[PDB]
Symmetry: C6
Subunit: 66 residues, 6 copies
Amino acid sequence: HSLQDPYLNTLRKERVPVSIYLVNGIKLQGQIESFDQFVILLKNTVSQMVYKHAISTVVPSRPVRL
Amino acid sequence: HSLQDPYLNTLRKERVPVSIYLVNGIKLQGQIESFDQFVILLKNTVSQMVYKHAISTVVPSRPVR
Amino acid sequence: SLQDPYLNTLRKERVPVSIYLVNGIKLQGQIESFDQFVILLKNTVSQMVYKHAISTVVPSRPVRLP
Amino acid sequence: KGHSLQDPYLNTLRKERVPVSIYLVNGIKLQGQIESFDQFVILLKNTVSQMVYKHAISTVVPSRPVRLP
Amino acid sequence: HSLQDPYLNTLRKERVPVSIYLVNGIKLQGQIESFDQFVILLKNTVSQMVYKHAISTVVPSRPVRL
Amino acid sequence: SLQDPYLNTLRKERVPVSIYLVNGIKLQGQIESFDQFVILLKNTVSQMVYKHAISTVVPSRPVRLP
């Protein structure tokens, strides 16, 4: 958890565009507005709450330094 | 946790129409009637119980908070 | 808990229900009993369904809500 | 109601050696009889004796009606 | 793990070749090198790490006794 | 556990790997870091992978097992 939090928090603070792929193959895009232990609030063309358990990978639009 | 609860509770109180997408791709629509640690009660024709573990995303029909 | 009182109402009232699995399959019958991890579904034949494999429980008619 | 239902149910199928079908979340249908089980897996006997993870199981359907204790 | 540990440990010790079916339908084959609470190390050309949560069934190539 | 030392070796030794997701997709790269729930993979694209979405981790060459 010592890696996930800083990573998501940095993406959030720096408003880094991200692509979030779900386990079912669907791709969501936007910026991370906030998150907690179980969900990620993604804002963009469509604001939405995403459950982490349904996420396979988070691919930042550019590398992030922690 | 700190975000999911306030978020769901807001959608509930404001009776905001939502779209709930399941991990299998199916889309449910209705209003959040109530929820607990493991389920969400989605109201429509009849209120159905959705297990959170089966949910991918919750998309509000309008801006909240 | 909201799940327990809800399932108990469906059980007590013997309400016909549809149980959708996470893989899209639809089961029909009535809730005979349940515990923390499974539900006993009675229909043409009885069967034990793991809750981790359930997506939604849809009653055939409105029922008292917890 | 932790395992108040699951344990007595699986144990009945086990002791009575009831033929059963176990459907997995991916759609596969396994057949045989429950040899034993613990909190996470089920040992299913058929052509061979295999270990099934409960997390991959959707439903357990007895070949015939069963009476719980 | 009253059954899981003894079972996997026997397969490991007897070096019994096994078929591991994943929840996505892919079939892996090899010998169990080791395992812990979350993963199993499956040896073949190279030893790959398999997450238990992705496993549906473990099928021994030949009968084993517990 | 086995997972940690195993992943740490692949990391410390910059071993190229293939991570197969529970949905079949194959990711390739080198493990940059990881914690209890995610693995940061890097190669052509950098990305955070949730362990719950991973089925197997396959090294490009044999490595010292834990």
